[PDB]
């Protein structure tokens, strides 16, 4: 006979993946930094070396907060946590940050207006792109397994130089398997270190920012993120309680 | 799409092949090479394909078929050697003698449409006259495709003349590489990637036109940010002249529709060299051309016939009569060339990138020129692109290029356009990449991208070219070396991170609360911060309710939902309604998320200088300016709390379930909590508890108001809880319990109090009188009835007494019980039941 | 690489049972005297094949536990005799189950690494020590209060503890 | 009124301290090894010199 | 264990877990933490 008088619930799979990512980096000696969802333009753009009147800033899918002269917004990425962490902590710094981010993107198979990102930031003496690649390889290995196909190619971000994007081979992608972007990364721009009072001749750094929902889609083979963002209990319950 | 760049492979190959004859790669290899050096290939569009007899034809005879509501033509077309075919066509944009592309029976058009000899409109039809869209050549425009005169002979292969074996590449160029918005830049990048000699298609030796004197009076306000302004006229062109097929086709494959040779050469040179060009009618300019800021409320009608409300910061081009162009955005209909224009004055100007960006975003005009000026344009090629553009116009539509030229290069005149030199250590790219590059790798790569490189010991002095204003610091030079060598050669080294301290107390508590609620049957919701429309009106909140003071988003995706949530309940209740409407009527949902609560100190902060660390006060005013964003925990319940099964009919959700969710959160937080009667919408005024930690309020719980439930379409009896986690202090208790093994004495006490005396107050009074011997107290009966009396209620508690050092006697326990009863009598008026 | 899957599962099981009202017991490996006779087990019941300690602190309790229930039931009796009659206890601990391959191994030379076969015979000689999870319940499963008279422990509660562990 | 129909249990404080110690060392990059409670003399004494 | 002491060195420690608990929580007598009375565990919380 059935015996469950108190049916099991479920923490959200996005939150449970965040816990697994967090545990992965904590086991490597890293810590978790935090930041508010409503951010100033100072930390979301300006301190991240974003130009003032330039498409690198204007083309962003930004939720601007009233009034028009408020210079407030819903943060478009977790990268303002880089600024908060470098202002609040002494060097060296090895942190990640997992929180919500907001863009004016309509819901499709891989985009939603309210999503999460996994930010990473390492600032120390003598760090290089090889340390960035070592960290991303551990990130990918722990979430996608040792058989995962990743590739790194040049890109652009105002707060990194050089900049790169990391793709993952998404087998279950709608329309056929293909490379799909996983996140951005690069070496921390010297102007960012200057904006936080750090000497770029004595310290270097790398940083990355990957999609949390995007990671979940690659890990579990979910082609369409609609169910993971609509909040139907039938989506969460098969994942278990998560205790 | 402002970062887009469309160009055909045949044009790219041509520019690259000048310095490396015979260079040709597959479209798949070209895509990978562009990705390896940093150019996102959004789409690779092959033309066609075409099979069977698709032949260039000559419209020989047109007989209009009258009687229909649409003009229909019966055409005879020469398909070669004067072998005529009868074609029925409904288009009108062609006459006798025009070159058209016909698909004869047996041919195959994209995609899979096979042509057959049919009879339409009572006439013979041996094929069809194709359009640009039906041939998978150009965009869907009105009419059929009419090749310009002399493009080909009647009978030529359609796929060969149209170049259907070509491939078009759609690239998304990052905003730091504006030089790649042209065939010049992308062909240079391919020469860097393939280690080829590159011949710049904008150089002087690729001869300059003569300079006798000024071409037109010009006055430039220096504060407008203009870096260069060049003007050379071309007089006496043929208005009836058209652009050849190679030029119109290349414009077509790049997304630009050809109009007249005066405009086509301005767009062709813009795509080839990257410098936007504008054509004016020389005889329509009245007086000295002036570059100045707009006035307060000044107006201007662009060439599209739309009036523009100009700003003080907009840079204009004006003469003595009307405004000729909005600087670097779009020209006006004043000096716009038309079929009447024979004297053309060509304009090659370098505008300030920030000014163009401001104007084009405010007027919503992301034109082909604005997109390039926004990303900086090479100011060293203005006259070169002007001469190339002027010679091309005179070669197509005739005329004489006037040997006059105006070339404003600032005051004083600027003769060197290279950015400042950069001093970088020779091994700096090697250090960043973690790779020991071969000797000379950095110096060779920086020369390929166009920089002069001198060597002095261990330090390189690098002077970037004028088309690379993004190269300002050594880090910029590092990116050029690494991306050309390929990022895949960088090794993988995990950094030895110092010993971390793991999760904080607050992060750990967020996990424990999530585990505790999930194990108790709750399903987590990630709540949207955008409030439902009219939600506080549905709740019946007062106008001055602090929850109404919301932060608002200017550009929400739903126009009726711009307010950010001051409470988590509206999103949870919306998630509850979705589940219930889908047939899942027994739901318990929870959420751990921040809210947004602005105050009167919430305000904007002007730009803080980013060339240094912000001061402590600047950090303080940035933090104080943001709305309060405390972390809340909230939950909603509806339907059956316990399901039905072989054990019984189940149990509906009641307010006590919300009270227990408070105690689930409190135990997970390791804090003690008291619940007190309260009235607070949207909760039921008689089934609402305010939750306190000590004397600090942290939230509310209970059943929702039935009027709120009715107006909101919620399930009946829906319950809710919301607490402020940041108001719950993190506790790190270190218990040291002492367990007494001595036997316990069990006694029950039954106390009559007024019906409105809270049961917790009676228990506290009993506990206070019982003393240290009281180990446990539990209420297990609440009774009303005529035995007790009206306005009264009886409560019965189970008491467990125990001594720490002796076997407690029945009498000693009764003394503690009597003292407990006396305490209840004094504090809540409890009467021992008899 | 942090915790293994098995270490993580031991934590999740502990959290799930504790949140469901169970109190953890760290069970002694020394069996109560005559416990399998109290259970009425057959003489050939594999649980009777126990590893024995030569010098126990209690001379009548030298046998190491092949099951976690005797220690849990002993812990239950202690709580009940002290006036705590509504108890749910659990334990996550290994048991000791010797086989016919359980034997002593003579000294392996320690001036070098033991060979792979020497490692294999050392491991094969020890009794099987699998990790068990166990629980016992008595009294009221749900206490009495303003909601009603409570509910006594029934077999279905043990079946649900299985499903708590399984989930 | 009291509301706890399912009284809370408790993992053992010794086990909870072990979890806290384990988390402390994992946060420093260490891992957790294991071994049986019944041991040979070889590993309990002899191999330990 | 087959490790060259000229190429590798090491340290090791072994501390009491109950002893740590007594120092951390100020528990003078470990009797209650080893007798399994539920009244000893419950004040520490669920531990989830
Ligand atoms: N709308 C969206 N929905 C879901 N996931 C999204 C959405 N937009 C972006 N993402 C994910 O977030 C990742 C990063 O997005 S990104 O805009 O390209 N890059 C950034 O936001 C940068 N801050 C990342 C970065 C780059 C360099 C150094 C640090 C951090 C993407 O690879 C996606 O997986
Ligand atoms: Mg924008
Ligand atoms: Mg990309
Ligand atoms: Mg760069």
Coordinates of C-alpha atoms in Angstrom, one line a residue, chain B residues 45-51 108-112 132-138 159 162-167 253:
Chain B
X45 CA 24.3 31.8 -47.4
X46 CA 25.1 30.0 -50.7
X47 CA 23.5 31.4 -53.8
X48 CA 21.1 29.3 -56.0
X49 CA 21.4 26.6 -56.7
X50 CA 20.2 26.4 -60.4
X51 CA 19.9 23.4 -62.7
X108 CA 15.0 23.9 -61.5
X109 CA 14.8 27.0 -59.3
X110 CA 15.4 27.2 -55.6
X111 CA 14.2 25.2 -54.1
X112 CA 12.9 22.3 -56.1
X132 CA 15.7 38.3 -57.7
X133 CA 13.9 36.3 -55.0
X134 CA 12.9 33.3 -57.2
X135 CA 16.6 33.0 -58.2
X136 CA 17.8 33.1 -54.6
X137 CA 19.9 36.1 -55.5
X138 CA 18.6 39.3 -53.9
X159 CA 24.3 31.0 -63.1
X162 CA 24.5 36.1 -61.8
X163 CA 27.5 34.4 -60.0
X164 CA 25.2 31.9 -58.3
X165 CA 28.3 29.8 -57.3
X166 CA 29.2 32.6 -54.9
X167 CA 28.7 32.4 -51.1
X253 CA 24.6 40.8 -52.0

